């Protein structure tokens, strides 16, 4: 398929990092914080990714102190209609559990 070039990527311990995709340009830091409402989201975690130019690529990353919380939030917020489009949440570590 799409031949993607890579260099070096290895997993690491720590909290549970979640990956958010399928997000419209309207999405903002405020909206994201409110989207994960109820769950304890680590400060400074919310990392928004932008293109080479600087514009929003509709992607964001978050971290969680507890794996149970991350999984629960993802499942409870999995396929949530954000703004005008649905967002996709995926767990970082796995599927292999250490």
Here the CATH number for the domain that contains residue 47 is 3.30.70.330
Nearest Cα to Cα of residue 45 among 32, 57, 58 = 32
Note down the domain range covering 26.
Answer: 1-98
3-state secondary structure of 34: helix
Query: Into how many domains does the chain fold?
Result: 1
Find out whether 49 and 61 touch, Cβ atoms under 8 Å: yes
Nearest Cα to Cα of residue 60 among 12, 28, 34 = 28
């Amino acid at each position: 398929g799409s031949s993607g070039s890579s260099g070096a990527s290895s997993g690491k311990p720590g909290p549970t990092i979640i990956k958010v995709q399928n997000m419209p340009f309207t999405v903002s830091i405020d909206e994201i914080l409110d989207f994960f409402y109820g769950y304890q989201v680590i400060p400074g975690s919310v990392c928004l990714k932008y293109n080479e130019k600087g514009m929003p690529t509709g992607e964001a990353m978050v971290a969680f102190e507890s794996r149970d919380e991350a999984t629960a939030a993802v499942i409870d917020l999995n396929d949530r209609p954000i703004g005008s489009r649905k967002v996709k949440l995926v767990l970082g570590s796995g599927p292999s559990s250490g």
